[PDB]
Amino acid sequence: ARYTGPVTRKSRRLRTDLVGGDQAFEKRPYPPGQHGRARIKESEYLLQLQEKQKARFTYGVMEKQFRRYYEEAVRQPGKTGEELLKILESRLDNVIYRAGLARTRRMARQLVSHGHFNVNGVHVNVPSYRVSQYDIVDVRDKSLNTVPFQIARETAGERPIPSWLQVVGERQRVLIHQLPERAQIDVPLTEQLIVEYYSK
Amino acid sequence: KSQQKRNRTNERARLRNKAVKSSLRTAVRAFREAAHAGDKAKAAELLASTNRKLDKAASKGVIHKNQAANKKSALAQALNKL
Amino acid sequence: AVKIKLTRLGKIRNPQYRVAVADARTRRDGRAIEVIGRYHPKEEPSLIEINSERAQYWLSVGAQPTEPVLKLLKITGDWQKFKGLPGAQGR
RNA sequence: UGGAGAGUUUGAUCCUGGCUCAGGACGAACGCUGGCGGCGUGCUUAACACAUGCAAGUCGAACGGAAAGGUCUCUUCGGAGAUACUCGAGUGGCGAACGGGUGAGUAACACGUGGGUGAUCUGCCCUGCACUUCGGGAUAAGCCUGGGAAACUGGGUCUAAUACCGGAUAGGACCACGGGAUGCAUGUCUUGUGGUGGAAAGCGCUUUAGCGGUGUGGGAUGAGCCCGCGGCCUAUCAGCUUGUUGGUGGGGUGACGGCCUACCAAGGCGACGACGGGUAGCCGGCCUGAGAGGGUGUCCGGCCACACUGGGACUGAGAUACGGCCCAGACUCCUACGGGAGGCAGCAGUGGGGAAUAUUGCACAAUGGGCGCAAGCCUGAUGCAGCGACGCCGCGUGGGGGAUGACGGCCUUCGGGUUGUAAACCUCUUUCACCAUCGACGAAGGUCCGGGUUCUCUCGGAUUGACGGUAGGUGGAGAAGAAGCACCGGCCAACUACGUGCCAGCAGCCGCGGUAAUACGUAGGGUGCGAGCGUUGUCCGGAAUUACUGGGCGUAAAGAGCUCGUAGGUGGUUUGUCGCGUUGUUCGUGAAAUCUCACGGCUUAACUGUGAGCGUGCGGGCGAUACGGGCAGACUAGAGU
Ligand SMILES: [Mg+2]
Ligand SMILES: [Mg+2]
Ligand SMILES: [Mg+2]
Ligand SMILES: [Mg+2]
Ligand SMILES: [Mg+2]
Ligand SMILES: [Mg+2]
Ligand SMILES: [Mg+2]
Ligand SMILES: [Mg+2]
Ligand SMILES: [Mg+2]
Ligand SMILES: [Mg+2]
Ligand SMILES: [Mg+2]
Ligand SMILES: [Mg+2]
Ligand SMILES: [Mg+2]
Ligand SMILES: [Mg+2]
Ligand SMILES: [Mg+2]
Ligand SMILES: [Mg+2]
Ligand SMILES: [Mg+2]
Ligand SMILES: [Mg+2]
Ligand SMILES: [Mg+2]
Ligand SMILES: [Mg+2]
Ligand SMILES: [Mg+2]
Ligand SMILES: [Mg+2]
Ligand SMILES: [Mg+2]
Ligand SMILES: [Mg+2]
Ligand SMILES: [Mg+2]
Ligand SMILES: [Mg+2]
Ligand SMILES: [Mg+2]
Ligand SMILES: [Mg+2]
Ligand SMILES: [Mg+2]
Ligand SMILES: [Mg+2]
Ligand SMILES: [Mg+2]
Ligand SMILES: [Mg+2]
Ligand SMILES: [Mg+2]
Ligand SMILES: [Mg+2]
Ligand SMILES: [Mg+2]
Ligand SMILES: [Mg+2]
Ligand SMILES: [Mg+2]
Ligand SMILES: [Mg+2]
Ligand SMILES: [Mg+2]
Ligand SMILES: [Mg+2]
Ligand SMILES: [Mg+2]
Ligand SMILES: [Mg+2]
Ligand SMILES: [Mg+2]
Ligand SMILES: [Mg+2]
Ligand SMILES: [Mg+2]
Ligand SMILES: [Mg+2]
Ligand SMILES: [Mg+2]
Ligand SMILES: [Mg+2]
Ligand SMILES: [Mg+2]
Ligand SMILES: [Mg+2]
Ligand SMILES: [Mg+2]
Ligand SMILES: [Mg+2]
Ligand SMILES: [Mg+2]
Ligand SMILES: [Mg+2]
Ligand SMILES: [Mg+2]
Structure with a gap:
């Protein structure tokens, strides 16, 4: 399933904005509800809970799938938080967002869902597809010249391109030099609280 | 079902095997009587005839070769001890 | 036998x-005495490897x-090697 | 490479110590809700009783034959002709002991692991060496009859075989005497002489169609039997045993053996739990856990046991002989009352029990299996499909802008706040569903035709897929067809209003409700999760509350009233040796799957393939001797005189 709900409420509860763009701010404080102005007790469970919430709603992942991503990360050699970030970052729709082909995360997800991309000449339409090192991502050649994809053809200058993927000329294609390192790539969160949440 | 054919052939085989084994048993008891008498004269060829019959039964497949050999050894030693 | x-x-x-x-x-997927190869009927023609000395031993x-195993042995040439025929490789 | 705590005994405190909760899991059930796909999974209770259909046949290249089709065939003009491909019934071979089901029994060499078999067997298959030689009497079937209600059965004639029987020759049969090797006591293996013995089967041929048969040496395979070690509760079960323990001679077996028998001796097992009672199929594994442990044995795989209940044998290479035979018993059915028939714990299905578990489906296309020279034929194995959110995984119910703070709801200190960029509206894309269309891989295969003579090889041709006109691809219009469930006092994220007023009710704990309830019911709001969400049941965790890792006994539960002493456990200093413990290394084994790490393939994932780990162990060889232990000594410090 998908959330498909007001994103501003979900940012206002977690006290952090996760969207940016044209609807970057709601131009008002953060009382997320009717009692949203209350100065409430701050438990230790709450910090871990809301950090994992930020991690999930940054990417639109569902709890059952994030849980599996957690076992993958903790079971991977190395560390845990950076591996969790790397796994959550290698998602193909996230790659589409970070390669400057998307206004937001939701619409990048919809473009991946509607099958507007081919990786090794393979038509993929699963958002949770995981990209890999030396993967090329190609837009479906019969899908270009369409308005929401060509509106991102000329607006490829403002949001920076990270240093693990790469975009090329008018044929908008993506090359992955190596797997990312999200800890040095745009963390609006601390990965050390997800680990503590998944220990109780 | 058509195992009735097997049912009939099993009965025929049972009759043949029964007849053969009974004949060997009579031969063996006759030799035992001869050895108990101990004349050593007629037993000397009753042993040959009985061993021949045991071998023939083993070749016919009514008994097993090892059983035939066991009985032949026992009877030959019984003769030698008399 | x-x-x-x-x-x-699969x-x-x-x-x-x-x-x-x-x-x-023995049932089809039972305990085998010895596995000596594999056969995948889904690749470019297909995928076939036989040990080729354990096969000869057996x-x-x-x-x-x-x-079908005879067909594979004819393809791989082990059957021809074993029987004494010219073509020892035919893949 | 992995370990979290919280509430509750008191006016308060610190300990001790129970109880309870937060996690995970399920072959699940129930409540509300419910879009799709992929891959799994589905009688846990009555091993209760079963209507119906199907689950084991095949060979005419073994045989006599001619009920059926096709024939050249005569001719009846509706009947003829085994000579003739072909073939119902029948004799004969092989198969039917596998495959499939269930877990009742079983505490046992049943299972797991490692050995032994000089104590054994093994159809078909591979392979070496020999041979395949003479005869003879019947009967099934047919035909004529008899008995019986049936189920079946008696007689007379009549005919074969690779059916049956008797001979000749043939060493791995036997007896006696010897040699040569080896050892682990019986012995084993190989040889020499003498004396006794033991088989066979033929059929076919478009002309190098081809199938066969018997004795033996050696392989492979499968199996039997014996042993070490390992895995439940119970002493409020303490005496069990007379073929019992052992021996000798016989018998029996494929094989050792009290396996059986006659005789002889008087032993055997037991506190390291005999005998008895309860429960239970065992394991690879599965769940949990930081680990050690605990629970469990369901899908899948291996082994065992059983087939209405109890007993027995026959045939055979091989029998718990599920769809074989005999007997007894219970049950259901037929009967002419004399007598007969049956066995879903095979697939599907019915009743019943139950909280609860599926279609009387398709195909032999693929793999495995049986018979056949082969084509072929059989296969409810198997390959798939149907049904059930029963589970795991994946994807949808849109996206980008937009304070009318729309409208309304609710709260308000009546000022405003909230739902809330959320809607309206503008615009964009159509994953899945819908419509139309093309259409698979699984098949380097199976068949007949051509080079190739055959064997082997392509060649090309038809033709062959249950799944399936499915997956998938392509195209069309449209935000278009698609969200719910639980909770919000603390644990534990999430708060107010109204109604109610120890009532109605809630509750895992302790508690909440007797007139201003964040704990009852509704509303608004919020939180978690999401095609799911809650409850119940069960297991582990938390629980260091059975403590090996890893706890205790002055007063919290806990030192026997005290001593002596049996088995047992433990043991001072020192020398030598052994190498049992211990430790090093190597070989074998520890199936596959599952698990971990890395890739590879399904659009991803679940799932699947490959490689390495793991498999803690056990057995064999070869090293070490510090410590433990054994064996042979020494010493006086402990102990005693
Ligand atoms: Mg037959
Ligand atoms: Mg008589
Ligand atoms: Mg004997
Ligand atoms: Mg008190
Ligand atoms: Mg006090
Ligand atoms: Mg406590
Ligand atoms: Mg059952
Ligand atoms: Mg016939
Ligand atoms: Mg035959
Ligand atoms: Mg048989
Ligand atoms: Mg069976
Ligand atoms: Mg059982
Ligand atoms: Mg054992
Ligand atoms: Mg007659
Ligand atoms: Mg002779
Ligand atoms: Mg003869
Ligand atoms: Mg006695
Ligand atoms: Mg004796
Ligand atoms: Mg039982
Ligand atoms: Mg623990
Ligand atoms: Mg029984
Ligand atoms: Mg029954
Ligand atoms: Mg019985
Ligand atoms: Mg046989
Ligand atoms: Mg027999
Ligand atoms: Mg029986
Ligand atoms: Mg039965
Ligand atoms: Mg049956
Ligand atoms: Mg049978
Ligand atoms: Mg059934
Ligand atoms: Mg019920
Ligand atoms: Mg009922
Ligand atoms: Mg088939
Ligand atoms: Mg087949
Ligand atoms: Mg349900
Ligand atoms: Mg809270
Ligand atoms: Mg009130
Ligand atoms: Mg309430
Ligand atoms: Mg899901
Ligand atoms: Mg517990
Ligand atoms: Mg414990
Ligand atoms: Mg301790
Ligand atoms: Mg204690
Ligand atoms: Mg003490
Ligand atoms: Mg006291
Ligand atoms: Mg006390
Ligand atoms: Mg005292
Ligand atoms: Mg003592
Ligand atoms: Mg002592
Ligand atoms: Mg000692
Ligand atoms: Mg000492
Ligand atoms: Mg394994
Ligand atoms: Mg891949
Ligand atoms: Mg060793
Ligand atoms: Mg002294």
């Missing part, structure tokens, strides 16, 4: 096969291959 057969150990629609030396009085000692 002793057979060289194909045991289906999934519901991808019939992977192992080339196993098994006694005939053929020499008396195992009778089933008919």
